[PDB]
Design a binder for this molecule. Structure first.
Ligand SMILES: O=C(O)Cc1csc2ccc(Cl)cc12
Ligand SMILES: O=C(O)Cc1csc2ccc(Cl)cc12
Lengths: 343, 343
């Protein structure tokens, strides 16, 4: 509930973010047509998500900063940096939906799939990335942590980018080579491609804004956060198949998309000669008959029970981790975030 | 000749740049496969050009910095930042060749056109962009101008990105709307898409490294450089058609690519009802017969003579500009660069 009480002032600040960004054409009417395009890009790709990453920046801010140092301006910056995280998010989404040729995202049609856009979406994505640094300059230009944020964001893009390469190398479009879907590879892909920018970035950003720039502190927070990120992804894979669209709010397709899901990774470590063959002969197909056939092989391997088990162990681990590395940070920082992920 | 005497130590430093970038997997063997991909990306897209933008950083450095302050380390940084400019260049090229669906570049096949790559080139381009900031950190992390360079590069991407949008809005793929190919639009497209990162960036970078961070000085250098950039583009358009492949080293295709060239912009400001119709009925076609037909309409309008004229006026203007805003910078900085562009 710590988030719901913040989501309003957050999603509402979005309107200002836009105004600010699309108001440099005021002094340069020449590039006006481009700025109008930028606004359309932002209003379509940065809106429509759950804003968890963005909100985490704000929620963490209030918890790390003293109630009196949270003046109108300090909250204004936290919202802006919260939206920069969402912009980084938007940047990756637009680009990723093009590479894997997705059809929809957040319920609507993918930006590049929109008539008239197409590959020009590549430039749009690059722009969303740029606005990040334009905002950090417009608001935190003079703050003592200005350079900290810039580097954090830049590094988060590099991490995510590297993770993206890894994933493209692992499950090529048209290569059901289940031989590379190993254990370590799955954890490396999740670490760089998701864990870092989804969990470390948001909190690390709120830290630097609170003055907590200690390499040790960030090192500790990262250890907890990356572990959370890893669980989140595994619970994402599980729910993708054995989940319930009514609750999840989306139907799974990892099996059909030949994804290096956590499920298939466990299926491969627990498969007999003939079983592997069955998978190697159904993982990827679009036919629901061949897909459900795979789900059956998973259930038969009691993977869902394996998850339930791993989940219990994970919960303990994270708690053990929070009790060891949270300090000098308020355990609530991690506890709140964790409770929003687990169960 | 000021460049040729530097191009060697420059293109040779490229080998070290790579080593440095692709050596972080030493402490993280996990993302090794990705780092190997990064190396292939860099060796294919950052090499094979004339390195003018990159060299300009180095050549300008030696001219702005006192001969004694040019120790082994100072030259090491100048080469690195010179290559960052080339990496920014590579980043844009890869992305642009995909958006306009080009077939070749620098003689070879476009990276995305390479079998196995395709749209994954979108991530590759994003990586080339990342290496820029990874290098600035590995070498100028401790320099007093560190933040200056980071912002300069970030801003140069935003400018280039905005210019790119403008160009995509002006000459859409499948819209021979010669109505938007105006005068001001052409200058706005060139200013953001080329002039800024091609001419201002290289010198501005060498300035910040020399301690020249004055907002006024940079403002002056920018005024000269953006004007040079504009001429360069106009001479680029002219030579694209009325040039000579033997000297230019490339055959023009602006007419066929429905490009908002400088030629067509002048052709439209100097066209009678029927003449405009002729153009409006040949500009874009692939048929050499319909293309040469356009060249004829240009020559008939004495545009080549109009260029010769504008060129003489331009040369004077730049000289008048250098004599007014060069100081306190060594006129040779701009003079050398200009002589490499003109005639
Ligand atoms: O929303 C996502 O896709 C992943 C994520 C990152 S921080 C955070 C906080 C709460 C919840 Cl529910 C999810 C997340
Ligand atoms: O090389 C290019 O394409 C444009 C350019 C930027 S700085 C510079 C210096 C010398 C020459 Cl010949 C060209 C250029």
């Amino acid at each position: 509930d710590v988030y719901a009480q913040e989501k309003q002032d957050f999603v509402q600040h979005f309107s200002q973010i836009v105004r600010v960004l699309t108001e440099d054409e005021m002094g340069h009417p020449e590039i006006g047509d481009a700025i109008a395009r930028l606004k359309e890009v932002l209003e379509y790709n940065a809106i429509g998500g759950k804003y968890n990453r963005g909100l985490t920046v704000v929620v963490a801010f209030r918890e790390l900063v003293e109630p009196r140092k949270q003046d109108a301006d300090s909250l204004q910056r936290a919202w802006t940096v919260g939206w920069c995280v969402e912009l980084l998010q938007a940047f990756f989404l637009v680009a990723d939906d093009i590479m894997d040729s997705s059809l929809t995202r957040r319920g609507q049609i993918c930006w590049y799939q929109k008539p008239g856009v197409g590959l020009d979406a590549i430039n749009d994505a690059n722009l969303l990335e740029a606005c990040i640094y334009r905002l950090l300059k417009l608001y935190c230009r003079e703050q003592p942590y200005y350079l900290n944020l810039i580097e954090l964001f830049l590094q988060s893009s590099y991490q995510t980018e590297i993770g993206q390469t890894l994933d493209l190398l692992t499950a090529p479009q048209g290569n059901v080579d289940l031989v590379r879907f190993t254990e370590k590879r799955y954890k490396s892909i999740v670490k760089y491609k998701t864990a870092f920018y989804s969990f470390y970035l948001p909190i690390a950003a709120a830290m630097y804004m609170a003055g907590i720039d200690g390499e040790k502190e960030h090192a500790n927070a990262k250890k907890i956060l990356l572990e959370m990120g890893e669980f989140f992804q595994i619970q994402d894979d599980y729910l993708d198949l054995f989940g319930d669209p009514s609750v999840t709010g989306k139907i799974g397709t990892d099996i059909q998309d030949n994804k290096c899901s956590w499920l298939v990774v466990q299926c491969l470590q627990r498969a007999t000669p003939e079983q592997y063959q069955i998978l190697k002969e159904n993982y990827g197909q679009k036919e629901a008959e061949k897909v459900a056939r795979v789900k059956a092989l998973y259930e038969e391997l009691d993977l869902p029970a394996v998850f339930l088990q791993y989940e219990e162990d994970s919960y303990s681990h994270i708690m053990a981790l929070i009790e060891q590395y949270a300090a000098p940070l308020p355990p609530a920082v991690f506890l709140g975030l964790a409770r929003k992920i687990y169960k």
